[PDB]
Amino acid sequence: MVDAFLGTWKLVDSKNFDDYMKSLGVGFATRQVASMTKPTTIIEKNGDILTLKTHSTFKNTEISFKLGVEFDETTADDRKVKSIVTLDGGKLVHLQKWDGQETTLVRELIDGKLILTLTHGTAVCTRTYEKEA
């Protein structure tokens, strides 16, 4: 079910990431740096457990989860959130909840590229990742 998402992915395009970060309350200096990094996202499975790593020159994160089972997460911008990841329409949908707010991180494969759509408030960011061999 998740298998076409698995592997190593590199950022090759980003639209509206500053809007998304600003909506989350990320400070201007962090937004500066993050507007110029190109993270690598590694998605691996072991049985029912998925691990999603995001690596860059600035920030690194790692989460492990089972689809459909809530987990605690501390995000790159230090939000302590309640998270759940599921498949919906073939998309990997990651919902974070904190302080009554929500954000969604939706990953879709389109013509072999991984398109990550980040929504918080009215801000909608689209980031495109291409697979590494």
Ligand SMILES: CCCCCC(=O)O
């Ligand atoms: C606040 C976290 C943002 C993650 C952006 C990305 O994985 O490209």
